[PDB]
Design an enzyme around this catalytic site. Sequence first.
Site, PDB file in Angstrom:
ATOM      1  N   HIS A 244       0.828  -1.138  -0.018  1.00  0.00           N
ATOM      2  CA  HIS A 244      -0.104   0.093   0.106  1.00  0.00           C
ATOM      3  C   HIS A 244       0.850   1.239  -0.068  1.00  0.00           C
ATOM      4  O   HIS A 244       0.406   2.425  -0.134  1.00  0.00           O
ATOM      5  CB  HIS A 244      -0.935  -0.427   1.151  1.00  0.00           C
ATOM      6  CG  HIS A 244      -2.128   0.651   1.312  1.00  0.00           C
ATOM      7  ND1 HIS A 244      -3.191   0.528   0.142  1.00  0.00           N
ATOM      8  CD2 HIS A 244      -2.822   1.121   2.275  1.00  0.00           C
ATOM      9  CE1 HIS A 244      -4.128   1.378   0.708  1.00  0.00           C
ATOM     10  NE2 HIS A 244      -4.109   1.758   1.723  1.00  0.00           N
TER      11      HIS A 244
ATOM     12  N   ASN B 221      -5.601   6.993   4.778  1.00  0.00           N
ATOM     13  CA  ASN B 221      -6.897   7.224   4.557  1.00  0.00           C
ATOM     14  C   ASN B 221      -7.220   8.663   4.816  1.00  0.00           C
ATOM     15  O   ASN B 221      -8.503   9.358   4.469  1.00  0.00           O
ATOM     16  CB  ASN B 221      -7.964   6.639   5.349  1.00  0.00           C
ATOM     17  CG  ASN B 221      -7.992   4.993   4.896  1.00  0.00           C
ATOM     18  OD1 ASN B 221      -7.314   4.891   3.972  1.00  0.00           O
ATOM     19  ND2 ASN B 221      -8.504   4.340   6.002  1.00  0.00           N
TER      20      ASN B 221
ATOM     21  N   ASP C 202      -1.633   2.302  -5.398  1.00  0.00           N
ATOM     22  CA  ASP C 202      -1.345   0.778  -5.485  1.00  0.00           C
ATOM     23  C   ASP C 202      -2.877   0.444  -5.958  1.00  0.00           C
ATOM     24  O   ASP C 202      -4.011   0.836  -5.572  1.00  0.00           O
ATOM     25  CB  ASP C 202      -1.363  -0.051  -4.238  1.00  0.00           C
ATOM     26  CG  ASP C 202      -2.019   0.779  -2.991  1.00  0.00           C
ATOM     27  OD1 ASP C 202      -2.103   1.798  -2.901  1.00  0.00           O
ATOM     28  OD2 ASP C 202      -2.776  -0.004  -2.162  1.00  0.00           O
TER      29      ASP C 202
ATOM     30  N   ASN D 106      -9.211   3.879  -0.223  1.00  0.00           N
ATOM     31  CA  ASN D 106      -9.562   4.956   0.625  1.00  0.00           C
ATOM     32  C   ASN D 106      -8.550   6.256   0.538  1.00  0.00           C
ATOM     33  O   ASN D 106      -9.154   7.077   1.072  1.00  0.00           O
ATOM     34  CB  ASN D 106      -9.337   4.505   2.083  1.00  0.00           C
ATOM     35  CG  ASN D 106     -10.783   3.893   2.160  1.00  0.00           C
ATOM     36  OD1 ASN D 106     -11.989   3.770   1.683  1.00  0.00           O
ATOM     37  ND2 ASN D 106     -10.477   2.404   3.011  1.00  0.00           N
TER      38      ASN D 106
END
Length: 189
Positions: free
Chosen positions: A22, A69, A94, A115
Site C-alpha cells: 500500500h 485514509n 496501488d 481510501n
Amino acid sequence: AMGMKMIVGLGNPGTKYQYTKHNIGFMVVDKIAREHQATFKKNPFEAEVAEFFHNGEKILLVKPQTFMNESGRAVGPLMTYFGIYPEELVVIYDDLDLAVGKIRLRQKGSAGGHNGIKSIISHLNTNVFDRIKVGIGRPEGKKTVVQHVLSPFSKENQPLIEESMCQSVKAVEYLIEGHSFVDAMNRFN
Ligand code: NA
Ligand code: NA
C-alpha cells in the site's frame, strides 16, 4: 492551470509500512527523488516534500504523512500552498485490480474502494486528475484486502514490482520531458 507541477505518492508513514504494497506510491516517488537525487524535507502540511527543477521550472514530489485514509488532508492544503490545481497533479498509488508488473495511466475515475484516493477526491472536490495505478495484484492466498496491502511483496513478485516501478518512473520522466498525459497514456497503457 495546465502542466504537471506535483507528483503525489500514496502510502503510510513509518518504518513498519515502508515496504508494504500500500506504500507503492511512496516507493515510486522515492525512486523519482533518487534519480533526480532530490531532497525530501518535513513540511508543515503533514507531508514530506521534495523539489527538483527541469528546464527553469519546479516539480514537487509529495509523500503525505497523514496515513493513507487522510491523504487529502495533506494534499489539498499543500496544493493551495503552492497555488496549484488538480490539473497540475499526478497521483501514484496501488491498484488491486492490476497484476504485479503492470501499470495503468488514467485521467479520472472513482476511488473504487481505495481510501487514499477517496480522501484526495473528497479534499479536492473532483475525481478528474491524472494518476498512475501501479499493480499490486489481487489479495494473495487467503489474505484479507487489508492484510494484503499491509504486507510486503512476495519473493515471486519482487522482480515484477521492480519492473513496474521502473516503468512508473519512465512514465513520469516522459511527463517531465514535456509529453502530454494523453501521450503518456498512448505509450504506457
Ligand atoms: Na513508510
Ligand atoms: Na481516463
